[PDB]
């Protein structure tokens, strides 16, 4: 009844969750490149032509030329007023590169220091000067990840990104401030120098159909959205990357009926070395098309 | 924000959808106005300076998971990548 249907749902829910989770993980941190699977050849556009003629030596000339066609001064900030409905300290935040030991990117704070008017009336104006020395360098690029300005209600703004490009240009600024419409800080900054297949997935439990479905994106894996491009590739993908299930394909000229069922045969300390009983296994061994072996240096 | 639910609704099963907020504005010495857009989810995408006209068609940004900055993409979950073991006796 509803108790059996919930057991069906429960059976399919556990592997679906795993596969949908791995879809996220492996899209960022892969186990292997899908373009390298033999049943996924179509995935890779490119070929191995360049290689035979590629000369590693010629890279310098090409790189030196790219650099030749690519892109000092004090930074002064004048504060006009803080808007709300005050003491303003500016800092130079140096976020440094993480070294092996470090838990995270070390933050180095350099104080710059002043009193700025609260809700200053324009047409009633009668100033606050806070300049920054050339603490930035293309020399300490191996140490400092990025440079940023801290205003303190608080607000932050990067001066140079990771790829080290000046993004705080000369002009009239207005930044939004935050607790611990909207409090604002107003300043002036200057640098003073093709045919749809019908693919049905029938979910079987107790070896009889309990849920009949139809794929919306026909040759995409329903679990991980991989666009296999051929039915051949989709069936290999399913059977190998989703082995927690048994897939039973049934051919149709208009598409396919894939029967999904639960595979009931699915199945060190990390602290110091651990003794083991030597064991060898040969997972794959296939004769190569072109014989590459260095037979000249072979003993008898 | 549940990553799984988000990717399944907004993300079409493979992408993260970001929303911008104007956190700063500047008026150059030349007749041009630029805005500083801050992305939400935060701390994954960097702040980008954008033309006052360009605010629209940049209110949202859909990034495919394989296109997310890999250094910062791990902030999305404790088990995307982990150092096993974290604590090392030897090199």
């Amino acid at each position: 009844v509803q108790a059996d249907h919930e057991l069906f749902l429960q059976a399919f829910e556990k592997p679906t969750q795993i596969y949908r989770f791995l879809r996220t993980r492996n899209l960022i941190a892969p186990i292997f490149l899908h373009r390298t699977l033999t049943y996924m050849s179509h995935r890779n556009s490119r070929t191995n032509i360049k290689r035979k003629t590629f000369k590693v030596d010629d890279m310098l000339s090409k790189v030196e030329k790219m650099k030749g066609e690519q892109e000092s001064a004090h930074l002064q900030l004048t504060f006009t007023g803080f808007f709300h409905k005050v003491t303003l300290e500016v800092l130079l935040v140096k976020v440094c590169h993480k070294k092996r030991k470090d838990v995270s990117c070390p933050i180095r704070q350099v104080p710059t220091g002043k009193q700025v008017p609260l809700n200053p009336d324009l047409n009633q104006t009668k100033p606050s000067l806070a300049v920054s020395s050339n603490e930035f360098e293309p020399s300490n690029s191996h140490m400092v990840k990025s440079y940023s300005l801290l205003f303190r209600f608080v607000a932050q703004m990067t001066v140079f990104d990771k790829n080290r490009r000046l993004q705080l240009l000369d002009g009239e600024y207005e930044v939004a401030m935050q607790e611990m419409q909207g409090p604002t800080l107003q300043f002036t900054l200057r640098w003073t120098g093709r045919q749809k297949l019908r693919i049905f997935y029938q979910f079987l439990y107790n070896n009889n159909t309990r849920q009949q479905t139809e794929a919306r994106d026909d040759l995409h894996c329903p679990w991980c959205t991989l666009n296999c491009r051929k039915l051949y590739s989709l069936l290999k993908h399913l059977k190998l990357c989703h082995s927690r299930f048994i897939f039973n394909y049934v051919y149709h000229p208009k598409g396919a009926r894939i029967d999904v069922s639960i595979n009931e045969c699915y199945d060190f300390s990390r602290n110091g070395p651990v003794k083991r009983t030597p064991i060898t296994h040969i997972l794959v061994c296939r004769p190569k098309r072109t014989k590459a072996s260095m037979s000249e240096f072979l003993e008898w | 924000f549940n990553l799984s639910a988000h990717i399944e609704s907004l993300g079409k099963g493979h992408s993260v959808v970001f929303h911008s907020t104007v956190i700063a504005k500047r008026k150059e010495d030349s007749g041009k106005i630029k805005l500083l857009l801050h992305w939400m989810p935060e701390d994954i995408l960097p702040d980008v300076w954008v033309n006052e006209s360009e605010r629209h068609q940049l209110k949202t940004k859909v990034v495919h998971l394989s296109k997310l900055p890999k250094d910062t993409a791990l902030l999305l979950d404790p088990n995307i990548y982990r150092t096993m073991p974290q604590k090392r006796l030897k090199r």
Binding site: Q17, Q212, E214, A215, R216 | S4
Partner: peptide
């Protein structure tokens, strides 16, 4: 028409 496979599987996660 039948429910879509991708929606069935999504249902299964969000539970």
């Amino acid at each position: 028409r039948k429910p879509k496979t991708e929606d069935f599987l999504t249902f299964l996660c969000l539970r």
